[PDB]
Amino acid sequence: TPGTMLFREILHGQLGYTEGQGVYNVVRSSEATTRQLQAAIFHALLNATTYRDLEADWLGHVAARGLQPQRLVRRYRNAREADIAGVAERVFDTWRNTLRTTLLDFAHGLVACFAPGGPSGPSSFPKYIDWLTCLGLVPILRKRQEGGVTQGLRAFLKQHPLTRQLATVAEAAERAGPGFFELALAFDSTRVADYDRVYIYYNHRRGDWLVRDPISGQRGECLVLWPPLWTGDRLVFDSPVQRLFPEIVACHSLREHAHVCRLRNTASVKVLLGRPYIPSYAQDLERLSRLWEHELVRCFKILCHRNNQGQETSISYSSGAIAAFVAPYFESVLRAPRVGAPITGSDVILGEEELWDAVFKKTRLQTYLTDIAALFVADVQHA
Amino acid sequence: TPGTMLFREILHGQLGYTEGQGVYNVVRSSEATTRQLQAAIFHALLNATTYRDLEADWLGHVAARGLQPQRLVRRYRNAREADIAGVAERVFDTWRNTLRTTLLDFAHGLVACFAPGGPSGPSSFPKYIDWLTCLGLVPILRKRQEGGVTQGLRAFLKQHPLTRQLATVAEAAERAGPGFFELALAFDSTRVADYDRVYIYYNHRRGDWLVRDPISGQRGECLVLWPPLWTGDRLVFDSPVQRLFPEIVACHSLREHAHVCRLRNTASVKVLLGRPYIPSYAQDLERLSRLWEHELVRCFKILCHRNNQGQETSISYSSGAIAAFVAPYFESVLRAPRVGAPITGSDVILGEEELWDAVFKKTRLQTYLTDIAALFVADVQHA
Amino acid sequence: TPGTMLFREILHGQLGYTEGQGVYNVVRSSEATTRQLQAAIFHALLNATTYRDLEADWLGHVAARGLQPQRLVRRYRNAREADIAGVAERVFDTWRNTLRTTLLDFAHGLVACFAPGGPSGPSSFPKYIDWLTCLGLVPILRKRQEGGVTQGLRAFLKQHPLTRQLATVAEAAERAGPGFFELALAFDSTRVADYDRVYIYYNHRRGDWLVRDPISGQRGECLVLWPPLWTGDRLVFDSPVQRLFPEIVACHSLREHAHVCRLRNTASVKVLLGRPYIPSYAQDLERLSRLWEHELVRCFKILCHRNNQGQETSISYSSGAIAAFVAPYFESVLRAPRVGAPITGSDVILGEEELWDAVFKKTRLQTYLTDIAALFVADVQHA
């Protein structure tokens, strides 16, 4: 019993502390998962590139604006003036604005990110993985139930098309709507496990290693091993948190042993009745601080941008980890394989409009809408 | 009881101090939230880009100025002189001034920022979060009541359209007015909790962890856990302020222990009746000063601009935190999901006219007004 | 009682001193507030950009000069000579001079800056805030009375239009005159509190924290908390001046303890009747000097320009503070929300003609006067 209690506590730095122990906190960050959720919600909404959508919005834009070019050619009167340089700019810029119309949809991607990320019942996802990487194993509390948050996502959607310009744009999105609606349920219907309430270290006798939760709520449901654990008739477990353990106790003992001796060493003159002092730990705290620093950066594949002159540390989550750790923690927990695209270590730098550039770099309908709009416009002024 | 008292006090540096402890004060800054409030109030006012607004101001500008171009063409008499280079500059610059008319609206964004930011009852928002990050938990004192400040926001608005040029501009804004008016209430109607008056560490016995306020004012309302707390039949709590605690006491003891011995060591010659001194703490204050420095910068994602030659520290709040910490502290407290746009670490550099550039870079009506004004002007001089 | 006495004194360096303690003096500077007052008085005077003002001065300039261009065209006789390059320069430069006419107004902005800044009764404003930041709280002595200084501002104004060129320019300013006149009263009618005469640390028993002044002059009026104070049945108060306190006393004790021992150590040979010395404080004064240096620069957001080769310190007040500290100390004391524009850390570099460039960069009427003057001139020489 006490070890699995202790290995949670010693990562918490109950006893001793070094500088490197704080670098775990960047692994505890939720930055990657929000980027993954925000790119997740993108692709399903970008998919419908139909002729009927792109015209009926633009042909609707034709009549109220007066876009028939016979009215325009009278105004120009000039072969010298490039009328396309007039019109096609005015085709693009006002339809740059419909990316911001698509940004008016985007807040569901914000809400259904903090629908797990925000509240207390399910925490933010990768907050939970770092207990799992602490112990070296994953419990999952799988149940179908509790779709209650996504109803607030439903009445969210009926509020938006007030202009009615939004609806004909989002008609392509609402045919993808149950495509989006089902994916919103799946993580939000699942329950991720609770660290103390689940019991560990209680298996069957080597026929398999299988430990389940006892609690008055439920029994245990699923176990996921990214490392397995090594039993030599004795529980020894793979973790980075194992790799601290024999030295930290030797560190913590050394801090404790030199400390007690100093209090006894507070005596002026030795009293002898006839009828050397070495409390020192200065180097070893420095060694351990370097140790746990270099340990953790390789373990979870952390990207430490070191500046010229070796000083500035721009800390970020590397791209190699983000396909190796997020997506298994994503997909094996999510079970919906629609979100398949990994996104670069470039992405963590990027803000949300850059994500729209990342939308625009995927060019799903983006370049496709621009060309056929530009083509059908251009030659009419050439005529 | 005394620990939650103490962990507030030890962050306050009751006992001992290091250089890094002062770097908490930049986390205590309110710089991000004012930037978020100032960008918040922007988008709702920028939204109405209707043909009727953009013309009736300009067509009103047509007659009193005498803008019918038949009067102008007599003056020019010159195909060589680009009359558009005359007129369209004079279209733009005087309608650059209507951005400053929009800046005459802006002071409501200033007042409703210090309407929470200024007074004593609700403090500035992120002043409160740093007690919450001190303890690792959030109490919220949620009540509908007390909309008293926003009435001063109402009589604020009736004072402005004195020129009556402002009103026809702000008619588009006053249809967005109840859009703005309701959002001004929501944070201003809520009450953020009080640190000592709320009681902590008093829960139910592991069926849930739930502690509420006793006070003669109200009972406790809401609890928000960004970390949860780790009970091993014993309250151990996740915080950065936990991570100081075992070493600071060992620091503070070391400062206390070496101090007392020196006073006893103020004796000239030992008096022996027949019938070694080690008070030293010089290194360990330096280690702890580096420790808490490197701890805090990773914890809340702080941006430390280190110059060439490693010396100049331009301290600022990084963009990764500002989407990870402000917006949950914003939205879960605010409950109004309209303000969805995060803003860069670029923004903290920027002043308010740069925010108007940030308004102008969003191009909501900004480029849209300029084009149709420029188009309808240009070809008439071409004729 | 003695602590609030002492915390004023210990910032004053009654006991001990370090290099960093002198860096408080730049926080005690009044440089920002004069820049804010000088930009304050600008915008109200710049606002009136009416057609009637800009013409009746220029059309008045037309007749006495003889500006009707039929007289000029005889002189030029040359299509080669750009007559606009003659005339429009002479339109601009002599109306560059009316910026210096506007500078002849400017001395009221100088007087009503040292009308609080100069005399003994109200001191310069941010001299007072640094006592408030010393203790961590603000008393305000709010009374309507004593508008006596602004009468000298009134007879100031009747002296100026001697040329009568000034009056028709300042007619636009004197319609803004009661706009300026009322704002001059508000800070000058208020009284900012007095440090010893106001009593502190005397509240009501936790139902609120509320302390008022007893003095034979008045009672206490207002209290403003930028931090609140932390009572654990014991007054502990948030301040930067709190953060010096436990270590400075340990510093001051260390300086006192090693000092006394040295005087006793002035004995040649120990006298023994039968029938080790460690006074050392060299490092700890250096640590504290670095401590209070790095503490204060982050606390009030101070800008320390460090040169190449790390040596030159151009000390100035940063732009982040100047929107976070000046304006609350401005507006919550002033109560007149007209002055809403914050001004950059660029501004503290700038002198007053650069402020006129800052006037000119706002382009309120500045570019607007220049264009319609240049337009109506130009084509007549083209004719």
Automatic annotation (TrEMBL), chains A, B, C:
GO terms for biological process: chromosome organization. The keyword rRNA-binding does not apply. Keywords: Host nucleus, Viral genome packaging, Viral release from host cell, Virion. One of its GO terms (cellular component) is virion component. Signal peptide: none annotated. Pfam families: Herpes_UL6. This is Capsid portal protein. The gene is UL6.
